[PDB]
Structure 1
């Protein structure tokens, strides 16, 4: 494909859990102790108090580059927390012209999304005797 489809998705998408009055686990709140390792991958609901909130900063999704000699553009998609930027124009036309041109990054055609990180903690009146309260890290993107 010419470019990754993520580059032109102008929208965000989210799921809203089942109404408990129609009801399933996503409708039934869990305290931060009940979130065992069994739940990894699932959609759940959590009840608690927020302890701290970060301020908004951008995160990359698709990065855009320009090749100087052959005047051609290439894209890279980022999922992990870190990445290596590109540094060689591997395009077949550029290669067959033996044109070992240099790649440079561009903001004006890259795609970002808003990011924020928070932390949630269990209610003090639900802590069992002699224990210290536990907490979870929450991530938030889009609108």
Structure 2
């Protein structure tokens, strides 16, 4: 446990291979009122959806928007 962060070379036997499924990295969010796109980067295991808007133009105003995510604009892996 002192070789952390190094670049290594190991060998062995591939055992219990899982299946390939997409990993979500960043999520797009359509404003529908201010017309911006909010982006949230997740590096944790789980996460949460976020609040109604975080624009600069929906900000400093009485009526903020209410958002929802989108699929085709997100980046997967």
TM class, shorter-length: 0.7 to 0.9
Larger fraction in helix: 1
CA contact (8 A) 2:38 2:54 kept: no
Q: How many residues align?
A: 77
Question: So what's the TM-score if we normalise by structure 1?
Answer: 0.50
Larger fraction in strand: 1
The 1-side partners of 2:62 and 2:5 are apart by 47
Report 1:30-69 matches (<5 A): 37-69=1-33
Which consecutive aligned stretches of 4+ in structure 1 deviate over 6 angstroms post-superposition? none
CA contact (8 A) 1:61 1:112 kept: yes
CA contact (8 A) 2:34 2:55 kept: no
Q: Which runs of 5+ in 2 are unaligned?
A: none
Structure scoring higher RCO (CA < 8 A, sep ≥ 6) equals 2
Question: So what's the TM-score if we normalise by structure 2?
Answer: 0.86
Q: Which moved more, 1:44-53 or 1:63-72?
A: 63-72
Superposition RMSD in Å: 1.4
The 2-side partners of 1:46 and 1:95 are apart by 52
CA contact (8 A) 2:28 2:74 kept: yes
Q: Which runs of 5+ in 1 are unaligned?
A: 1-36, 114-143
